[PDB]
Amino acid sequence: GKTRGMGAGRKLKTHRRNQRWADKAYKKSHLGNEWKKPFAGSSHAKGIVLEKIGIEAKQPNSAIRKCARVQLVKNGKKIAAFVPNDGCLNFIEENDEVLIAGFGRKGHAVGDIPGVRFKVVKVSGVSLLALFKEKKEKP
Amino acid sequence: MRAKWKKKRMRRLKRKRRKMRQRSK
Amino acid sequence: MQNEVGDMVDLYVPRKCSATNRIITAKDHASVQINIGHVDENGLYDGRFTTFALSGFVRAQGDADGSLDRLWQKRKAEIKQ
């Protein structure tokens, strides 16, 4: 089984160093690929609303999720961001200024929405929550 | 699908890829 | 077991097997207890007896008979027979 010699510290250390790589989280963090994602290791990002789209919810659900195809200004990547809080697709217009955030599962699709990992947090410098509750008006 | 025949399909794909790569070097 | 005053603190003191010394649990239903009566020089039962307890483990082993026989041979020496 294990090497229990008192003189075998190097063997145990090297074996653990080799075997840490099978870990999903450790390999995710120490491979450096997290910098090639659209956010490039950032909590939020900013973007321009390229277009407004809808995606059919995955089975067995049946609905149309009002997403938005936007383009990040920091690297130019094009991503789809969810728009929650029904009626909040109306606030978003064309080529508009939005603040995007992750969806919650750390680079994983959330819910029945196929392949969406971002949600719109702000539009034109105003939070979607304030507009939804009529606390603020779009400028 | 039987994994034996999947392995055979993979081998055919590998040899075809090798031929295609040898075509253009 | 013993408090700083010097009194009992556990509910009871268990029995331990007279062959393997392992204690007898309150839910050990294979553990038994035998009283072997003693006789007089004529061969009359005098009303006193020697008590042995065997745990379920030693019984289920099958060494209960040998252990009890050895215990009786050893014990009868002090109290004659």
């Binding site: - | - | 408090n3 509910l11 268990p14 331990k16 204690i23 839910k27």
Partner: protein, 220 residues
């Protein structure tokens, strides 16, 4: 109301006992649930879970509710009952009966000092039920119970005040979790400490020293 059907109950009913530690002392097979009613003064009962299990028949699925009950005053006595019945009421009642029938004594020791009212298990004790292994380790006077909800309830009913617990295996399985906890609570009285190994003296069993009233005074 109650007509004893076994020697132990017939012995108890008139009042030839005070506590139930002498029954434990001879490891007698308690089989009537009124014995623990009469002997143990305080009993508290909380049901732990009501799990519906199913058996698929040709017509449909026959469902039966299995109930878990924990019994015992918080002064060293605890028991566990499991009963599966057609509907929840009889399941709960039968599980209460079984739990009262399965009361065992627990040993409470000290952590490092013998200031009165012992509050902890005496040793490191473990219990395995299928896959769920539970371990309790002695804790100082002010620690409290460090455990999940199920072992916490079992230990509170057992009378333990402070302990350090661990767990391994699928503890989501309530039956195995609680059975392992209760089983190792039984083991708490099983370790041979250096104080216990004073030579034992023997006492007549209740079946043997009450022979006078057990030959043929059937029920009078």
């Amino acid at each position: 109301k109650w007509v004893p059907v076994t020697k132990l109950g017939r012995l108890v009913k008139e009042g030839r006992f005070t506590k139930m530690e002498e029954i434990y002392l001879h490891s007698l097979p308690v089989k009537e649930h009124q014995i623990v009613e009469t002997l143990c003064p305080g009993l508290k009962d909380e049901v732990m879970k009501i799990t519906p299990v199913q058996k698929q028949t040709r017509a449909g699925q026959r469902t039966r509710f299995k109930a878990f009950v924990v019994v015992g005053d918080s002064n060293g006595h605890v028991g566990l009952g499991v009963k599966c019945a057609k509907e929840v009421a009889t399941a709960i009642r039968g599980a209460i009966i079984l739990a009262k029938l399965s009361i065992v004594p627990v040993r409470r020791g000290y952590w490092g000092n013998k200031i009165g009212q012992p509050h902890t298990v005496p040793c490191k004790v473990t219990g395995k039920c299928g896959s769920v292994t539970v371990r309790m380790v002695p804790a100082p006077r002010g620690s409290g119970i460090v455990a999940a909800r199920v072992p916490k309830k079992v230990l509170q009913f057992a009378g333990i005040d402070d302990v350090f617990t661990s767990s391994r295996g699928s503890t989501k399985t309530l039956g195995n979790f609680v059975k392992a906890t209760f089983d190792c609570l039984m083991k708490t009285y099983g370790f041979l400490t250096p104080d216990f190994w004073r030579e034992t003296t023997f006492t007549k069993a209740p079946y043997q020293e009450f022979t006078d009233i057990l030959a043929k005074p059937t029920k009078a």
